[PDB]
Amino acid sequence: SFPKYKPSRLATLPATLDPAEYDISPETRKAQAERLAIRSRLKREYLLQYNDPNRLGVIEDPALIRWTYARSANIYPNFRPTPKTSLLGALFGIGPLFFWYYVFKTDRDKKEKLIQEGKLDQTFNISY
Amino acid sequence: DAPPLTLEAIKDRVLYVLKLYDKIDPEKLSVNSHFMKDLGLDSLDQVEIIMAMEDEFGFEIPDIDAEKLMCPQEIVDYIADKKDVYE
Amino acid sequence: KRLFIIKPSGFYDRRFLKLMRFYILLTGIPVAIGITLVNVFIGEAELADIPEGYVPEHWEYFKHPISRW
Amino acid sequence: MLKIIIPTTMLLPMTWMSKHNMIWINATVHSLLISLISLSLLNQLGENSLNFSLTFFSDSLSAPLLVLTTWLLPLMLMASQSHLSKETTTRKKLYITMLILLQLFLIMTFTATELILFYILFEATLVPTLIIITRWGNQTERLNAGLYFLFYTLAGSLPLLVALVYIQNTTGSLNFLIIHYWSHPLSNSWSNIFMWLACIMAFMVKMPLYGLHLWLPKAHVEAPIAGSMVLAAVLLKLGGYGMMRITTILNPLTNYMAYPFLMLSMWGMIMTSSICLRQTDLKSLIAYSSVSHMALVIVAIMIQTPWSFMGATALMIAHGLTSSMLFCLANTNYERVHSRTMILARGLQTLLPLMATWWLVASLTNLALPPSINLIGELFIITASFSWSNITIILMGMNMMITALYSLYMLITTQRGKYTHHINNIKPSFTRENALMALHILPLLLLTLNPKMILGPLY
Amino acid sequence: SSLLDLIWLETILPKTTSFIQMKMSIMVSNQKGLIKLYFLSFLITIMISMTLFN
Amino acid sequence: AFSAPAAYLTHQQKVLRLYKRALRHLESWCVHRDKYRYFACLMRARFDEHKNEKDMVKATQLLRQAEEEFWYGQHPQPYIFPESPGGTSYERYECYKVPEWCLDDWHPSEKAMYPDYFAKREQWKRLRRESWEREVKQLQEETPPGGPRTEALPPARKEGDLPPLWWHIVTRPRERPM
Amino acid sequence: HVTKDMFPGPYPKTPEERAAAAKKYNMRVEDYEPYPDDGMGYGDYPKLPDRS
Amino acid sequence: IRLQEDPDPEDENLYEKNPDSHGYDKDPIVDLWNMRVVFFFGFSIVLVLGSTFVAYLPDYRMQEWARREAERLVKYREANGLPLMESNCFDPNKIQLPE
Amino acid sequence: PDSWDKDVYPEPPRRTPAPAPQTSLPNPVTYLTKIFDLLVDRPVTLAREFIEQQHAKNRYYYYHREFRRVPDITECEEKDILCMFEAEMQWRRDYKVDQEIVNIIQERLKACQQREGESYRQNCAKELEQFTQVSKAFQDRYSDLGAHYSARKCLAKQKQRMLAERKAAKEAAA
Ligand SMILES: CCCCCCCCCCCCCCCCCC(=O)OC[C@H](COP(=O)([O-])OCC(O)COP(=O)([O-])OC[C@@H](COC(=O)CCCCCCCCCCCCCCCCC)OC(=O)CCCCCCCCCCCCCCCCC)OC(=O)CCCCCCCCCCCCCCCCC
């Protein structure tokens, strides 16, 4: 029939085409009810604080605080030297350095060879 | 820029569209008539009425809110509140 | 019908800009007037050969009157 | 130089003897007067330096740094009086005393004529900075930040002390003039390699060099506003000044020993710009921008051409002013909402118009926008690096693109969009804050008008 | 930010050195305060200084 | 926007949303009014053809196939109203929306420029402050012990009360503020 | 006002730890899923869907 | 609780007590005079006077001196047929090369 | 004008063709030039006359500094700090003068290209040769000294160049 749509990581699967959207178990309905209950509880708390007339300031967001903490200060305590981390770190932190070193050293060696052989167009190169 | 809307203007335009609907009898159409309890339409007809109102006033009614607009008075109130009409 | 336009308080920003303009122009305008008068009346020096046996000073080696001062 | 040194040592007793409510007024007024007096040092000669005495001398490289330090002191006073309202009188006076001591040490550091006196002063600058950070910082991490800053700097600088005393024993003098006139080539041997390494590594840690830079985010994020202003504006310039001074005696070994440092600086410039792209904290974003710009300055000093040195000096001055302004703006936002997260407060353009203008101007200068001195310095460094090699242009172009990206991203995130609904304590901007931003920004444009004053001796 | 700045540049220079110094400090200062033990140590030191230093 | 969402969309809600989306995309394809009316009548004819279906499994399969057909045949650039989320005029006036808490930080001279507005504003503030305790009491009386199971709020059950959590809904900025 | 128990912690290795983490992040225990323990520093932070 | 600790104080607003506050000090008179001295000294004195002083600093870098010297040397050398730029910085007669 | 030296800054004689109109139509350029002279040129000339009258009442003079020659780094002994200082300062002054010489030649080149316009490739060959020679000599003198250049380094470079030239001459004669 119609050509199928293949989702990617940068073009995800639409909800209307998700197979799980048309196969609803009774437990799925109670999961959705629990999710709505959690959202409603959080919404009620935020709205009460928001509409409080005596509140002056910023409603601190525990979720935002957890996010900013986990992004920076929680990374090193939870890092372990593994083969994957070691290889990725060595690659991403050493390979570019030596690649650029090889490129620049080769270029400058060729330039110096031309300078010594005296066949490089260096006229008008007054500023250096 | 454009002239401001009024409650009477919104009501007149919604009733104008509903009277230009064929499935609705113009004589028995009042601002309190229910689209299904006392007009005899169904869900698809209500969807078409909402789409006609969207085309009429040039703005979109979300599906979550449009399903509940079961009366011309409800449509008038919704559009007036969304467009910030108080007179 | 005119409707009230809700805006943040611009009084403090306007006051700061007014004070900044006043204090820049408090000394800037006299400086500009003085520079203009000096340039109009006490013009720049004219280059000349050093008379034999005369030893000038550094301000006599410089050209603009303000730089010489 | 005593006409500038003594008024600071008189700022000390005046601050300690003034009344409890006149401390800020007196300190600000007399700091501004001292800055005006120090403006007279910009009249330099084309042949040699200004040799005041056997102890202090001034050059085209020292003079703008001294003017920047003296102008930076009153701005730190204004920010401090913003955030230290509830402090006791004695602690306010101690804070002002630490700032005054830091300024005095910096002045004597830039004007010292011997390498050993320069070392003693530039190591003495650590104590007031460490006390300020670890005493008046806000958060818990100030202690760890102080430890990192202190031990990085000292581990860098101790081999420098050993190398300096060795060089004095070898040659007879550490006076800069004598070692410039009696300079001799450095043979390619392991001993010379390690002497080169000792000196350069001290100043590279002070710069900082990429891979030796973690203390910079740690210290700049966790220091009070005055500490952040002085750390980025002036204290990062001690490494550049030292490298521009000591490399007289390290030739021709610098031609061969500069490869690892050049590669580190270029790649780390790219890496820190990319890090800035994905930062959840505003102060961390500004700190990593500082790292990128100082990496560019390191590249300039290492390639070591007359066009690179002018670019290095211009970029140092421009970065000092711009980073100080950015830290002040971030601190005003923090004082509004008591948090450093970038996405917590938005719509600050529709809530605070003139601050939005200041943010726009500072962010425009943070990226190289012509004809600002930031662009002048960056362009000179890029041109010298192009004459050095023709792929440095690739690296510099990538860095410029990412710099524009993260600067405008910070501006768009903080200022544009819709305001956060629940943040209802954003009072209108103070005349003090607006005046602080004006005093940061106007001298930069005046320097753009007169650019030969900050291009160094090589001009 | 994560792999290099927060993890490996921290592990190489400041973290490894601090860990080594902490371990050496624990080793040095973990003594039971027994004169028998550290006087036997004195005897070993005397023998070594006599034999290995000429 | 003004209505609290539910936990899930029933089959009727799903099919009605699909019907509206298909009608909008068909209008995008059929630019002209007569052609659009013809093809919209045909589309409603298909919906009415499948309208009576006792088997919910078959109805769900028909819905799934219709959704796949829609996704294949959707307009790449459908018409969006200017003020709608995808529209060109969307969020244009968000920079002009200023809140009343920002209004109360005015200088006394600025406030004196509008003597009558701020008297009514003070009246509104008194009304808000005199009702918060009753609002919170009403909210906590009607909530289940477990907590709010939905995002809907109750009305004012008493003659002198206001619906709980009303201040920001009532005082939200106008759609064309400046 | 956030206590020391409301901050992200180590990778959960027991169902009690997983339940406590899910409660901490205001998530259902069935919906909670941490990043795989590869020593990348994620910790017990949930792996939410990669959408926008 | 584990301590007898003070509650975190509410943020203090300078605009509440003093509507026309410059944000320097709590005392209105001290705040006004702090603003006045900062603005006057900084903007007026430092900005204007230092900028004009720097603009009219004497030409101690010898830019115009060097230009006049170069003009004289160019005139003399092209009048006499000598090269405009000398080939050597020093005198090879005074330089003694190794054998 | 007597402001600058015509020999240092040459300008070819200006050949302006006489107008030869062929139509009876008025010339808008001529009318607008007359308007510009009447409205702008006369008032600015009067203002400059007044300013120059005010200047002539306060006529004072400034002089050009003359530096006598001093022994150079070749004459200075090894680690004789005073002679080294004098020679280094003299070398720096000579460096500045040479830079200004190159600047003058470059200004000649630019002005000649602009003046010649569309025939610049052929009519500016004379100024291109002078610039080539001056730039070649300046580059050989101060090409790769570095950021910390000094009279000693320039002398060492000259010694290296002289040794190379001597070796080349010997090889050619061999
Ligand atoms: C608040 C927000 C903003 C904040 C900003 C940040 C904060 C800033 C703080 C202040 C920073 C100051 C920085 C230092 C500045 C110091 C001054 C300085 O360096 O002056 C250098 C220099 C002054 O020359 P000098 O080196 O002192 O003397 C050399 C000569 O000896 C002189 O020649 P002379 O002696 O033969 O005669 C010239 C004389 C006499 O010339 C004339 O009289 C000219 C007459 C022209 C019309 C003649 C015909 C019409 C006559 C009508 C009547 C006819 C009948 C009557 C005739 C007379 C009676 C018979 O005029 C002058 O000398 C004028 C001097 C002006 C000095 C300005 C000083 C400013 C001080 C700093 C504070 C500023 C604060 C702001 C407020 C300023 C005041 C509003 O140039 C200027 O001041 C600028 C002149 C610009 C003229 C036009 C140039 C071309 C423009 C178009 C270019 C292309 C388009 C570009 C876009 C459009 C333009 C932007």
Ligand SMILES: *P(=O)(O)OCC(C)(C)[C@H](O)C(=O)NCCC(=O)NCCSC(=O)CCCCCCCCCCCCC
């Ligand atoms: P009212 O409350 O009466 O609503 C009646 C409903 C529909 C709720 C029924 O009670 C009902 O549920 N009936 C059983 C289920 C059912 O009718 N399903 C039908 C849904 S799909 C169907 O069969 C029709 C879909 C065909 C059209 C698909 C659109 C594909 C083309 C789109 C192209 C877009 C651009 C042209």
